[PDB]
Each structure stands twice: as structure tokens, then as C-alpha cells.
Design a protein around this ligand. Structure first.
Ligand code: 9GI
Ligand code: 9GI
Lengths: 301, 301
């Protein structure tokens, strides 16, 4: 038992991290087969990246993979990411995919500096398309990912920090999550909301782990739940959410709509100085998947 | 910015995990050079492990490393761990050390099942020498570790779960942390306490990240702080603790004893529906080291 914020084993991604240096900008890149993916603002000198990139040669890009100099033989820009074609394919390339995730979905982040991984933690893509990460200078280019058996599904590359200390970035094809753009002009996060289906998943995790104090005899309609949810800045719960929580409902014997009644009362009354899973807040960065994976034992390799 | 519960990159340990099977017991083992380390209760059939181990041959131990059968050519028992000598040294062996940590020190856990890593999270060794982990059937043999530049310092191997859902285990030389023994007889955790120096470190992390609301104009003596600390089930703070928090004190300009005054008032008055670092509880599983590493940028390779 127990319940922890669990990242995927990072080793398959660690063997892909590289340093990309050109001019006075150094950042992290991601080396899969013979391409190195990195944020496009590595390009030298309110920017126009087309104009800036036609002015560069291959030999301007210094790519260090360990103690080895990688030779750039081609380059192209796709959205906000640069793709540097190197003369060597990465022997540690895992089976992988590029995936653009939906808000509410979680992933693991391997924080890197100078192509050297520093730590791994678990994140969610917030409803306003930021992540509450942990990132310092030089972290851009670090990626977020999920692993499914033997396949790394990369879903995030880090670019910037917003004034409120949250983080914005792109999928691996360079498309920002949310309305953000890669230039140092005024922009800010939209107002965020709580990921309701995830909170319910976490409540089910509590029940699986022996915590029951927050349950009740009440029930509620989907409509009536959403009316109280909206009041507490929670995302609406759809029938689709209900269906994903099906198998957790069936493991525990608590109908989804019964767990909604318990959540409703938690919102209306607070937790009164009690904790759920060692937390005094309702936690919303576990998906229904995350819960099932951690309380059944699904490994990856 | 931001502040996350950050585990070390796990890749260096993932390449050491193996399956150890003998009789009807299968668990995880740790393959460094030509030895496989695993919990001794893999031994067949209130136990007497000497007697049980003299009755086994090498060919009773099935060790799977990937799709490869490892051949056991020797075995020895050291405390509660078994050391299986295999005919092949692990080519992915990192630079490493075996270290027995003090309570309050944190580490990363790579949860494994059948020699296949499942996830990584960060833990602390509680003052009562348990860890609040996340572990299912077949997780014993999973290790906890720290990384310092290029060196893995293994400090924990997992053995058992206690009735309260916390976890007990050994160092890599087989010595249990705490008073626990590896047999299925009544035993339970001592009463735990909060790791005071870690809570203070986390408060400094809050200040580094821009949170200041909990500070105050008051100050306090070391003695007077410990008198209120003891009342709230906190560990005593020693002058040695004070000195470790030195460099965090100097980064922030808040004398250690001034941060103690702020902690004192937090304990006496609660947090009044505010949060520190997205937490509504005082968090005690970050060491002063962890904070400095995460808010300065120390990498490892
Ligand atoms: C690529 C370098 C890098 O690692 N990184 C990550 C952030 C540094 C600190 N924490 C991080 O996660 N990105 C950057 O530093 C950005 C570099 C820009 C170069 C030009 C194209 C866009 C990326 N800069 C930022 O992330 C800044 N944020 C920002 O400019 O937001 C828009 C904005 C501009 C002006 C006013 C208000 C908002 C950060 C570093 O600046 C602050 C505000 C966080 C201090
Ligand atoms: C090695 C198998 C394994 O993965 N594992 C880890 C735990 C399983 C579930 N969560 C875990 O972390 N260890 C075991 O399952 C233990 C096997 C024992 C074999 C003989 C030598 C000692 C290890 N068993 C336990 O951890 C049990 N705990 C236990 O027996 O505690 C002492 C005790 C005995 C009797 C009464 C009260 C306390 C667990 C699995 O049993 C419960 C109580 C947690 C259900």
C-alpha cells in the first residue's frame, strides 16, 4: 500500500539528453535517431525566426552528447522547435512516439541542465495549459514523457516560465500548449480550475488504501454535482469522465455518482483538520490511470 | 522557480534491477559487478536462515536479467541480504557506494516488480525508521538511492510493509533500519515525529521562491523553540541542525532562529487556510540539501 507522486523510470529519456550550444545560448536538446530536437530560440539574436535561421550555418550549432562532439549536417524549424540533423544516430534511442496530451493528463519531467539530467518529477497539464513545474535557468529543452511498456511517449518540451512561477511549453512538434508564444512579451496564464475527474480518482485511491472517513450515504445527480463543482472553481464532470472512473468504481463498490456526493460534501464542509492520503488539500494531479497503475502494479520495460 | 518532490534520475539503477526466483518466491535483486543482492527471505520455506541456506544449491536460484539467464556460482548471506555470485559482471554497473543513512535523510525509490522498474519517487527515512512508501506484492528488493555527480549511493532495500501501511527495510548490507526483523511476527512502528530541520529547510525554499507570508518580527531562543516543538511532536532542533541551515539562512537573510520563530507561530496558530509551496501541511521530507539542489541547479552524471 501507500500512495506517492510517482514518476516513470527516467533512464530511457536520460540517454537522449544532449547540450545544444550556438552563439551565447546553451540549452538542452533531445536526440532520437539522427535528429536533435530543441527550442527554436537557441537561434541567434521581438524575433523573426525564419529570417534568423536562414542566416545560420550548420557549424554554428554545437551539440555535445557526453564527451562526444556531434556534427550537425542539416536543420529545419517545425513550429517552435528546431530539428538538427546530426551525422550519428543515437544508439540509446528507445522505442518512442510524439503525443500531444489533453489538459488533465499527467506526465513525468526530467529536469536537465547542460544536457545533464538533474531530477525527475510528476506533473499535470493544467486546464489553462501551464504546468506547475520546477525549473531554473537553462532548463528549457527538458522534456516531459509517459512510458507504456517499452515506448516513451514524449508530450512536453519546456520553454519558459510565466510571471506567476508556472511554466509553459510545447509538444515535441513545437506547438505550444495554450495561447503562449516564444517571445519575451507580456503574457500570463488564464485562470486555472481544479481537475475534477482526477480528484475523484484520488478519492478512490484513498478508499483502495483503506481511508473511508469522507464517504457518505448521500448521492447526487451529474447535473446537481456540476452546479456545486462550478461554484468551487472545479471543472465540469462529463459522462465521459464518469465512464473512465468506471473500473475504479467497480474495484471499490462505490458508484461514481456516490463518490461525487462525497466530494460535494468535502467541498462544502472542508476536511475539518483531517487528511486524505497524507494531504490536507484535495489533490488533482493523479489521473484514473495513475491510480490504477500504482494500486495494481503495472511495470514498464 | 517552483518546488516539486524531485527524485534523482533513475536510469543508473534501472540497469541494475534483476529478477531473483527460487522455489515459489520471486522478487527483485540488485546486480552490481558479478554479485546480485536481494532479501534473504527468497530462501525456501519462524525461520532459521542459516539452516535454510545450507540446504540450497546454486542451481536453485533463477536470476533473470532482461531476456538473459544469469548463472549463480556462489552465494553468501550478510545480515538480512543474500549475495548471489553470478558468472557475469553487469556491464551497466555504475560507480556506486553502500551507505547507511540517518533518520531525516531523503532518498529516491525505484519501485520494481519482477526485475522491471515501475516508477520512481522520493522518500524520507522517518525518525521511527520506517518509510511511507508505495509498494505492492513483489516489490521487496527494490532499492532506494541518492546520486552524487556520477556515483549511486544505495541506502535502502525494501523488505516489508507494517500494519499501518508504512514500510520497513534494510541497508544494502542487510541491516534493518529500526528494530524490525524479517519474519512475519507481530511488530509495529514506534511513534513517529516530525523532522524539524527539514520543515525549516522547506520554509526557506518557500522564501527563495517568493512566499513570505509566514515570517514574523519575532525571534526565539533554541531552548524556547524546542519547548514548543516538543509539544507538537517535533524532533528537537540541535545546534548542528542550525549550522546545516546556515547557507540557506545566508541566501535569504533570515537568521535560522528567526525562521524558528516563524515555525513556532505556524504551529501555535495553524496556517489559517493558506498554503506554503502548494501545501496546506508543514512538509518535512525535504532536507536542507534537497532545497539547495533544487533552487541552485546541481545536476548529476
Ligand atoms: C530557455 C531558457 C530557459 O531555461 N527558460 C526557462 C525559464 C528560466 C527560469 N525558469 C524557467 O523555466 N526560458 C527562459 O528563460 C525564457 C527565454 C525566452 C527567450 C526568447 C523566447 C522565449 C523564451 N524566458 C522566460 O521564460 C521568461 N519569461 C517570459 O519572458 O514570459 C513572458 C513575459 C515577458 C515579459 C513580461 C512578462 C511576461 C522568464 C525567465 O522571465 C521571468 C518573468 C520568469 C523572470
Ligand atoms: C518480499 C515480498 C514483498 O514485496 N513484500 C513487500 C510488501 C507486500 C505488500 N506491500 C509490501 O511492501 N514483503 C512481504 O510481503 C513480506 C514477506 C515476509 C516473508 C518472511 C520474512 C519477512 C517478509 N510480508 C510483509 O511485509 C507483511 N508484513 C508483516 O508480516 O509484518 C509483521 C507482522 C506480522 C503479523 C502481524 C502483524 C505484523 C505484510 C505483507 O502483511 C501485511 C500485514 C502488510 C498485510
Amino acid at each position: 500500500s501507500g500512495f506517492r507522486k510517482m514518476a516513470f523510470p527516467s533512464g530511457k529519456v536520460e540517454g537522449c539528453m544532449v547540450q545544444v550550444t550556438c552563439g551565447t545560448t546553451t540549452l538542452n536538446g533531445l536526440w532520437l535517431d539522427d535528429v536533435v530536437y530543441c527550442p527554436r530560440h537557441v537561434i541567434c539574436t521581438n524575433p523573426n525566426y525564419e529570417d534568423l535561421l536562414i542566416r545560420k550555418s550548420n557549424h554554428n550549432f554545437l551539440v555535445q552528447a557526453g564527451n562526444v562532439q556531434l556534427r550537425v549536417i542539416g536543420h529545419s524549424m517545425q513550429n517552435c522547435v528546431l530539428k538538427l540533423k546530426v551525422d550519428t544516430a543515437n544508439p540509446k534511442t528507445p522505442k518512442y512516439k510524439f503525443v500531444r496530451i489533453q489538459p488533465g493528463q499527467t506526465f513525468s519531467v526530467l529536469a536537465c541542465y547542460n544536457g545533464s539530467p538533474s531530477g525527475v518529477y510528476q506533473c499535470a497539464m493544467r486546464p489553462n495549459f501551464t504546468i506547475k513545474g520546477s525549473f531554473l535557468n537553462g532548463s528549457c529543452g527538458s522534456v516531459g514523457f509517459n512510458i507504456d511498456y517499452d515506448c516513451v511517449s514524449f508530450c512536453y518540451m519546456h520553454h519558459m516560465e510565466l510571471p506567476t512561477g508556472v511554466h509553459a511549453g510545447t509538444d515535441l512538434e513545437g506547438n505550444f500548449y495554450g495561447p503562449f508564444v516564444d517571445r519575451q512579451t507580456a503574457q500570463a496564464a488564464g485562470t486555472d480550475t481544479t481537475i475534477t475527474v482526477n480528484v475523484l480518482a484520488w478519492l478512490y485511491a484513498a478508499v483502495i488504501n483503506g481511508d473511508r472517513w469522507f464517504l457518505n450515504r448521500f448521492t447526487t445527480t451529474l447535473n446537481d454535482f456540476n452546479l456545486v463543482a462550478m461554484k468551487y472553481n472545479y471543472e465540469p464532470l462529463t459522462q465521459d469522465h464518469v465512464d473512465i472512473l468506471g473500473p475504479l468504481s467497480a474495484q471499490t463498490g462505490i458508484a461514481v455518482l456516490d463518490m461525487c456526493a462525497s466530494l460535494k460534501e468535502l467541498l462544502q464542509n472542508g476536511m475539518n483538520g483531517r487528511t486524505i492520503l497524507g494531504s490536507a488539500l484535495l489533490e488533482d494531479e493523479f489521473t484514473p490511470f495513475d491510480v490504477v497503475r500504482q494500486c495494481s502494479g503495472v511495470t514498464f520495460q
